[PDB]
Amino acid sequence: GIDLRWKHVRSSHRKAPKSDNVYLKLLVKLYRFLARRTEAPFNKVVLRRLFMSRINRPPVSLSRIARNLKNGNEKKTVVVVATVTDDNRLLQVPKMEVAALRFTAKARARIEAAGGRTLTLDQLALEKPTGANTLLLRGPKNAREAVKHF
Amino acid sequence: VQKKNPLRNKQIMLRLNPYASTFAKEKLGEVKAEEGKPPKVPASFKELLHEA
RNA sequence: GAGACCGAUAGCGCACAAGUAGAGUGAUCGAAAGAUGAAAAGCACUUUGAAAAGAGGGUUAAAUAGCACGUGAAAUUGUUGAAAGGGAAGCGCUUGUGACCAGACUUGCGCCCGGCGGAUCAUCCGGUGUUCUCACCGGUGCACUCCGCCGGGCUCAGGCCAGCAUCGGUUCUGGCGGGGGGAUAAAGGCCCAGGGAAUGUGGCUCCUCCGGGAGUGUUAUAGCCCUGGGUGUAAUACCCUCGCCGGGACCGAGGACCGCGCUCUGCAAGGAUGCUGGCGUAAUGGUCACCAGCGACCCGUCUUGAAACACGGACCAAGGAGUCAAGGUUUUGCGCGAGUGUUUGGGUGUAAAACCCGCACGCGUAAUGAAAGUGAACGUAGGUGAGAGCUUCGGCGCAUCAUCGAC
RNA sequence: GACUAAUCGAACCAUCUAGUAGCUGGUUACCGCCGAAGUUUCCCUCAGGAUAGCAGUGUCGACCUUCAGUUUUAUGAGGUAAAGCGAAUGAACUUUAAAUAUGUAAGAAGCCCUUGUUACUUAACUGAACGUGGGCAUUCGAAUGUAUCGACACUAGUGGGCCAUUUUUGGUAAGCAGAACUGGCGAUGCGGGAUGAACCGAA
RNA sequence: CCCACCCAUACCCCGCCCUCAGGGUAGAAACGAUGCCCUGAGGAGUAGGCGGCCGUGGAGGUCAGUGACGAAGCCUAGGGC
């Protein structure tokens, strides 16, 4: 016998989505290829967020995007791996290029009416395969009723 | 696919140590000591050795 | 009129002359029990029995369906066959015996000749289709070209068990040749020079049983001890170490090449090949029964720390115990998203489905206070330290955390 | 306390009713991955509770920062042996100094210097705290090890049991009774002690 | 005190199973990518927790599925996984 006071630890993170969405499976295959064959850390972070559950992908609003588009970020491509929602408190939407997992109808309409562009993540993979000149944004994780109750 | 002992397999020994053939050829494990008449043990050493 | 219900221990207590039979004075209690066959064709006739029945012979598609009746399990029993058994059997590992079995194999592929039988040989032309350069179809072959068949010959690959040779991995065991160390072993032999004694050799003296004793003293007609020196860097033991040659066991994972290398025409170098024999079947292998060697408490429960006590278990079949609803909560998937939720209802319908519709309403979008009430931006929605990621390489800084402010 | 249809300290029948039990019994295929626990701390006890600790599944965060039942070094506790007193003085003597385990500390997240304030404190702008600025990256300032991170969420058993070594406190005619650490067992097979909860080897 | 010898699931070497870990795999001659290839470590378990599989009655779809030339059931010192 061998004395092993320490214990080998199995992985405590997701390695695959629990979702059965076929298009998400295709996206996961594409970003597995990109994070294996490139050196860009952007692709690895994107792959990990594609694995995540919905409470780990809180929505990002247009006012949050407009806040982060200030101070030299007006030309960077915004990348969100969750839903982008509309904020009707934001009366003037700036021009922006946003790639998201999905958009709400009003958010897509307001971005296109302001003159920006909405992209899917596979179009993002085509145009920026190394994540150059991008702004990777997350929504508020702890802004949940249960997390308040913790 | 298979670990081979270089102490048994001479080819593995030559792979890991090219000087092994020169060692065996020149017999560096059988080097004689330098010549010269050895001085005898001094008497005080033997007296201390056999002192009760 | 129906069902993602039950299928004769189920489903109503009742699929049947069931609220019957039966019990209780009475109020009341309350079962068991479905299936021959398509058709009775439900066995004529003979025979043996008092009879029940039996045997022949019949019916039938089947009596291996005979009103004990579809199928016909187990407990348990009879006969037949095999076996074991000196105060339990049963079980595990491993042989053997006997009985009984499943595979595998029977030849294939490729060449070289000879003989047949045919032209769906190559090229070219026309049409058609396609992946747009590849094909198919019709004409052209005139048999040194193609395609099958039949005889030989040859190579290779083929089933089971084994033997030998050359290797690789691991390992046990025997012998041989060297090197080094120590007080450059210590001893020891042979010499040289000193010194000494006794368990005193020879000699000499005295006693005797004539066998041997006692005394004296230092090598003589034996020898020994101590010291120094030479041979001598002597030998050997012990310890350490560099190699070489045999004897034996178990194992052969991988599957084009690639690499590290070497003793470089090649190899023992990133894992076994070569040669040969018998057999080709119960021979190997497997199953069952039994004997033999070794191993082996009766399960479940309970208790405490544990055993023990105690409790349940004659045997078999079928039945037999964390379910459903409402409401929370956390997590997963999905739709939409500052909104969200059609299904109370209405419209519609191929009619309990599916499809469509919207007012109200619920929850969320604002909090706080007992209440009256009041009600969230100084600032690119603030400062500072971190922070993934991006960067024009100056910085910008997500989530989140810490800390100081503001409402 | 006899008898009232084999029924009497309160008959029989049906129903409420599938009454309640904390007590007893039972609770239905397989393989794989992990895997425990017995005063820690608080509460009036027994007919007591929580709770720490120890576990498993999910995630998430830069799985960033390193940490560690260990030694060494400086320094405490144990000065206790020891050596000397041709050193002084006399376990209580000391120049020096035990074994055993043991506490604290050992960096850039650190060390100082300076500036001021103080509502602390000090005779006191004096210390200290609070901030401010600066200097120190020339070696990042012992060894060994390091698939050992952190934070949430949800779920579960056990949370005043037995034996033993050592240490310690009390005792008995003799037995023994409390604590503390550690190991084992309850949950565990194997080899040996002929045999077996507590023995030896080894998981 | 000395020499040899005996054997544990312990230790060493080799094969095989599983689990965990770390790598490779698309201008695809390209794959049950939920796959395959390479390498290393590890393997007892009550309460307890988690995963994957097997089996039974019934429902939708599908297999142009099986079946009186014999479905289901039952028996079997007969076999295979």
DSSP string, A15-39: SS-S---HHHHHHHHHHHHHHHH--
How many Å from the CA of A131 to C1' of D14? 85
What Å resolution does this PDB entry report?
Answer: 2.1
Does strand E come within 7 Å of the CB of B3? yes
- The residue assigned the tokens 């630890």 is A9
Please give the DSSP secondary-structure letter assigned to residue A93.
P
Q: Which residue is nearest to nucleotide C398 (CA to C1')?
A: A137
Residue A89 token pair: 């408190």
Q: How many angstroms separate the CA atoms of B7 and A47, rounded?
A: 51
Helix, strand or coil for residue A55?
Answer: helix
Q: Which of A118, A150, A143 is nearest to A56 (CA)?
A: A143
Q: Which long-range contacts (CB under 8 A, 24 or more apart) does A54-59 make?
A: A55/A141, A55/A144, A56/A141, A57/A81, A57/A82, A57/A83, A57/A101, A57/A139, A58/A82, A58/A138, A58/A139, A58/A140, A58/A141, A58/A143, A58/A144, A59/A83, A59/A84, A59/A85, A59/A139
Report how this structure was experimentally obtained: cryo-EM
Sign of the torsion angle spanned by Cα atoms A129, A50, A99, A134: negative
Sign of the torsion angle spanned by Cα atoms A53, A56, A59, A62: negative
Q: Which of A15, A136, A143 is nearest to A82 (CA)?
A: A136
Please give the DSSP secondary-structure letter assigned to residue A79.
E
Does strand E come within 7 Å of the CB of A29? yes
The protein footprint on chain C, as nucleotides within 7 A of a CB, is 168-171, 177-181, 183-184, 228-230, 232-233, 241-244, 253-254, 260-263, 267-271, 329-339, 380-381, 388-392, 395-401
A77 in Cβ contact with A40 (< 8 Å): no
Residue A97's DSSP bridge partners are A117
How many Å from the CA of A10 to C1' of D144? 27
A98 in Cβ contact with A78 (< 8 Å): yes
Residue A97 token pair: 């290029």
Q: Which of A86, A136, A131 is nearest to A112 (CA)?
A: A86
Residues 43-82 of A with CB under 7 A from strand E: none
Burial of A40 (0-12, 13-18, 19+ CB in 10 A): middle
Residue A149 token pair: 């109750």
